[PDB]
Amino acid sequence: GELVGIITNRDMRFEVDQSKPVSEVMTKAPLITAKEGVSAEAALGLLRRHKIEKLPIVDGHGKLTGLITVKDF
Amino acid sequence: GELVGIITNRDMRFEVDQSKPVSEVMTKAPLITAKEGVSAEAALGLLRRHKIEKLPIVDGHGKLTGLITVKDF
Ligand SMILES: Nc1ncnc2c1ncn2[C@@H]1O[C@H](COP(=O)(O)OP(=O)(O)OP(=O)(O)O)[C@@H](O)[C@H]1O
Ligand SMILES: Nc1ncnc2c1ncn2[C@@H]1O[C@H](COP(=O)(O)OP(=O)(O)OP(=O)(O)O)[C@@H](O)[C@H]1O
Ligand SMILES: [Mg+2]
Ligand SMILES: [Mg+2]
Ligand SMILES: [Mg+2]
Ligand SMILES: [Mg+2]
DSSP states (O other): OOOOEEOOHHHHHTOOOTTSOGGGTSEESSOOOEETTOOHHHHHHHHHHTTOSEEEEEOTTOOEEEEEETTTO | OOOOEEOOHHHHHTOOOTTSOHHHHSEESSOOOEETTOOHHHHHHHHHHTTOSEEEEEOTTOOEEEEEETTTO
16 A cells, blocks of 8 residues: 555656556656645645646655645646 | 757746746756767657657757757657
């Protein structure tokens, strides 16, 4: 149940072999994340600083709880 | 006249201040470039390897001579 990476459209658009496993293509941990209870301003600041469209939200143990996107804002 | 960087939509979409100079927002050199006379297959291989959409083409002296894009293929 541990968050070991994230795979988005950019990674997959440049790959031709569709049979390849996700572990070979994904952006591996550590990721840019935030804790549960992160404010909207802080989340958008983290998104804009690291020039990424997605921000996973994790609990105290690091297991994934949610996801915040720039598209929603 | 030296190629010192590149500034694309990903760099400009995450900057809130429009009065900032290019030098602060651009991706700085060294960039991913190819020589003059590079084949189409090599250019597409570089583009898909480095997960970028733009490939400057330079001469022997490093001057900017052209640009190849994935959108063209
Ligand atoms: N929270 C994150 N931490 C680390 N890397 C991330 C994170 N979110 C996305 N990435 C990586 O950033 C890169 C850019 O993907 P991003 O999610 O910003 O756009 P996209 O939706 O894939 O592409 P498009 O520009 O076509 O909309 C990808 O390689 C992705 O794996
Ligand atoms: N040839 C290159 N060498 C190095 N970095 C590059 C190069 N081309 C673009 N970049 C950088 O990589 C990121 C993505 O640029 P790219 O040109 O691939 O897409 P984009 O047109 O900005 O994105 P989108 O179409 O998703 O809005 C940007 O931060 C940009 O500055
Ligand atoms: Mg996207
Ligand atoms: Mg997008
Ligand atoms: Mg573009
Ligand atoms: Mg694009």
